[PDB]
Amino acid sequence: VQLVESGGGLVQPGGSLRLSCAASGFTFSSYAMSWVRQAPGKGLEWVSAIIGSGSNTYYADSVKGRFTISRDNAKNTLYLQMNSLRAEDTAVYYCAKDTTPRPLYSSGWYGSFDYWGQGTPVSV
Amino acid sequence: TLVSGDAHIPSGTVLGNFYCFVNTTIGNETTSAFVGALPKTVREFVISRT
Amino acid sequence: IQMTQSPSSLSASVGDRVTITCQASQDITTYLNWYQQKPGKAPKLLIYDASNLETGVPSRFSGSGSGTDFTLTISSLQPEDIATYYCQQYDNLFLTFGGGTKVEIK
Numbered sequence A: 001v002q003l004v005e006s007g008g009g010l011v012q013p014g015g016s017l018r019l020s021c022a023a024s025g026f027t028f029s030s031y032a033m034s035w036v037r038q039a040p041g042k043g044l045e046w047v048s049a050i051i052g053s054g055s056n057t058y059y060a061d062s063v064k065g066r067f068t069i070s071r072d073n074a075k076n077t078l079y080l081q082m083n084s085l086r087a088e089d090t091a092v093y094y095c096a097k098d099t100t101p102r103p104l105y106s107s108g109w110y111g112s113f114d115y116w117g118q119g120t121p122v123s124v
Numbered sequence B: 001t002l003v004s005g006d007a008h009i010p011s012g013t014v015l016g017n018f019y020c021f022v023n024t025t026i027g028n029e030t031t032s033a034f035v036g037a038l039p040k041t042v043r044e045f046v047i048s049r050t
Numbered sequence C: 001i002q003m004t005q006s007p008s009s010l011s012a013s014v015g016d017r018v019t020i021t022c023q024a025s026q027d028i029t030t031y032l033n034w035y036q037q038k039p040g041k042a043p044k045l046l047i048y049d050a051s052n053l054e055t056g057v058p059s060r061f062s063g064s065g066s067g068t069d070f071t072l073t074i075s076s077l078q079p080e081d082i083a084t085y086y087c088q089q090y091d092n093l094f095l096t097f098g099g100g101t102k103v104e105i106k
């Protein structure tokens, strides 16, 4: 199992980015995914999560309405769209994989991330 | 049977011929599990990633 | 949901019996995860469901608790265990992590 993130960089306040995370070594469409960030020298904060199908998407209130999560099951790629960034949004963003496989016709719970990516920096 | 170590050898076996085992470690833990028997002479060995 | 872990930091000698707690301020029943983040690397899952030991971490670790109080213990603190530990609930899908706790050898 392997996760690799990309798309980090430096953008002005109010800018936008196209964070991406490729997945390999497991059936991608069976597991929910979530992005979690770590501010410099701070604890982990959950940002957004998406189930396997993609019908349900959840966002934390600090990011609600500004970001947009998506996934493309055809080529095992998880995306995160950042819009109207602020100063406190700067952090290291990790893409995580849940531990519970679920059928593609189901919508379900999540929250036991067993694998994590290397993380990518985002500065504003 | 001293080298195998584990006591879970299934019944119906006959003492006197070679049985193949596997030792699986989980950190500082070691367990012996019985897998079966193999022919006396082998000509090719093949192992898959799965 | 809020989580608070005590102590914020601790230090113990090699082979000691370090114990770190976490509380949920709300009935979580059993839904708690324990992570470990070594400095500069991604976290790893140690315990899920507050007590189920993961398949790739030695039995030195243990976890217990229910409701509002939870606890993670290291039976014999080895030098490899210097890291930051976090508790994370999943009773609500807007899941939250704790503030962390750091260990130290002496």
Ligand SMILES: *[C@@H]1O[C@H](CO)[C@@H](O[C@@H]2O[C@H](CO)[C@@H](O)[C@H](O)[C@H]2NC(C)=O)[C@H](O)[C@H]1NC(C)=O
Binding pocket: B001, B002, B003, B004, B005, B006, B023, B030, B031, B032
């Ligand atoms: C696989 O594990 C077994 C235990 O099931 C080992 O057998 C024991 O090994 C220890 C350590 O050397 C000895 O002190 C004991 O005398 C052994 N026998 C018993 C009955 O406990 C075995 O050595 C391991 N084998 C391999 C090939 O690694």
Ligand SMILES: *[C@@H]1O[C@H](CO)[C@@H](O)[C@H](O)[C@H]1NC(C)=O
Binding pocket: B015, B016, B017
């Ligand atoms: C084990 O193998 C040796 C090989 O020389 C053989 O002599 C011996 O009889 C076998 N042991 C038993 C207990 O059958």
Ligand SMILES: *[C@@H]1O[C@H](CO)[C@@H](O)[C@H](O)[C@H]1NC(C)=O
Binding pocket: B027, B028
């Ligand atoms: C395993 O634990 C025993 C008892 O503490 C110790 O003697 C042995 O050296 C340890 N080995 C490893 C590889 O952790």
